[PDB]
């Protein structure tokens, strides 16, 4: 049969310096061969372990790993903001090999307020016929955060998406993008560009706006 | 320490894909290639192995006999192919070698397959630049707009990689053109504005397009 290996918590939240400890269990004899690997935001992936508790020569010592029964962890003695990444088992001791269902580890960390900045469109895209305008949420925690736009005093719809990064290695925050596209004629013929923060970090919403008029 | 990958591709539904992993190093050393899917934003699936020792390959089952290990062992060079594509092959593949008491040593860093019908499509690059409404007190954001390319991934450095603090990347997002497009941004001092300059480098390898673009206060 092929051996599952039940990983968990699926998502661990945890506070800077907190021991953390994930699960991995077996459900049929691997005999220590079951390894820990860790993958970055950006798709690397390394080894962290293997043979259960021999821990890879490149990863810190605050990393261990244990066995109890059919019972697998990966500890962290104290938790450091480099640490946030997903972390999957993998049991080598029989084909076909098999993984955990990883634990993607989260940071809490203080509340803090974004920096918003706002970009209007280069002149280069404006040439081609579309605008697309930028408003960015620098730096800020927790994740929930709401951006509305509004174009000479209205509130726009449906022509805005947004993108945020995964919590920063250094200080675990997120930052995020909300982009207003425009065809180049809508751009033209309105003034007032505004993106509109509301962040647990600010007492009230943050507006940041240009006049078309004035360049930026 | 480094396991080499061939780059992202684009192919359509129905056909195939063959892609490479090798060390970097000449080794002469026996090594087996073990082979992870990846889906975007998802876990992991282990695919197969081959032993270019002795030819040996091994598969899931649940790859239904779609996948092929191959090797040039002149080369230390392992391949996998995948047949009768359909979109749920899209996904970011690895290669991983393990040796004899070292399993798993090295990875690498994954090819990225995108099966699709619609065409490649190179972005053009914007800048985002710094100006008043752009900066706090002291501090200055600036960057560059990716936008409309297909398919993923681009990549963008900045000042040729000499600058990496404070750069956020973001996610790329699919527009209802069925485009991509993504922005790179940057926290720079406001007074190195007037002369130290930032240019991000933009790479599509898809559509074979780099283009350097300097951003200007
Ligand atoms: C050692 C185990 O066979 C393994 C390691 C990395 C990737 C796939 C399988």
């Known amino acids: 049969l092929d051996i599952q290996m039940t990983q968990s918590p699926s998502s661990l939240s945890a506070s800077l310096g907190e021991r953390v400890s994930l699960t991995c269990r077996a459900s049929?004899?691997?005999?220590?061969?079951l390894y820990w690997l860790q993958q970055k935001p950006d798709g690397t992936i390394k080894r962290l372990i293997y043979?259960?508790?021999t821990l890879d020569s490149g990863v810190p010592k605050r990393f261990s790993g244990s066995r109890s029964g059919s019972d697998y962890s990966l500890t962290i003695s104290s938790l450091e903001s480099e640490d946030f990444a997903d972390y999957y088992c993998?049991?080598?001791?029989?084909?076909?090999?098999?993984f955990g269902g990883g634990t993607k580890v989260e940071i809490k960390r203080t509340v803090a307020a974004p920096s918003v900045f706002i970009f209007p469109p280069s002149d280069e895209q404006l040439k081609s016929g579309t605008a697309s305008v930028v408003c960015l949420l620098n730096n800020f925690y927790p994740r929930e955060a709401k951006v509305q736009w509004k174009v000479d005093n209205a509130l726009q719809s449906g022509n805005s998406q947004e993108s945020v990064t995964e919590q920063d290695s250094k200080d675990s925050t997120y930052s995020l993008s909300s982009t207003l596209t425009l065809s180049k004629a809508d751009y033209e013929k309105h003034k007032v560009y505004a993106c509109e923060v509301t962040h647990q970090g600010l007492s009230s919403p943050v507006t940041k706006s240009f006049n078309r008029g004035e360049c930026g | 320490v480094q396991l080499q990958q061939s780059g992202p591709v684009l192919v359509k539904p129905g056909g195939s894909v063959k892609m490479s992993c090798k060390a970097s190093?000449?080794?002469?050393?026996?090594?087996?290639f073990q082979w992870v899917k990846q889906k975007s934003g998802q876990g992991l699936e282990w695919i197969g192995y081959?032993?270019?020792?002795?030819?040996?390959?091994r598969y899931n089952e649940k790859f239904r006999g779609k996948a092929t290990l191959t090797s040039d062992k002149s080369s230390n060079t392992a391949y996998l192919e995948l047949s009768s594509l359909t979109s749920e092959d899209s996904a970011v593949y690895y290669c991983?070698?393990?040796?004899?008491?070292?399993?798993?040593?090295?990875w690498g860093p994954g090819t990225l397959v995108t099966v699709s019908s619609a065409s490649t499509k190179g972005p053009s690059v914007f800048p985002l630049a710094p100006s008043s409404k752009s900066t706090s007190g002291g501090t200055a954001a600036l960057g560059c707009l990716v936008k409309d390319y297909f398919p993923e991934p681009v990549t963008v450095s900045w000042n040729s990689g000499a600058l990496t603090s404070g750069v956020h990347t973001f996610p790329a997002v699919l527009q209802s053109s069925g485009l991509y497009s993504l922005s790179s941004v940057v926290t720079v001092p406001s007074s190195s504005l007037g002369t130290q300059t930032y240019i991000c480098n933009v790479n599509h390898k898809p559509s074979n397009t780099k283009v350097d673009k300097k951003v200007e206060p």
């Open positions: 043979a259960g508790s």
């Open positions: 991983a070698r393990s040796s004899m008491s070292d399993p798993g040593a090295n």
């Open positions: 190093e000449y080794t002469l050393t026996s090594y087996l």
């Open positions: 049929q004899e691997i005999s220590g061969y």
């Open positions: 993998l049991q080598y001791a029989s084909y076909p090999r098999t």
């Open positions: 081959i032993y270019p020792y002795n030819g040996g390959t």
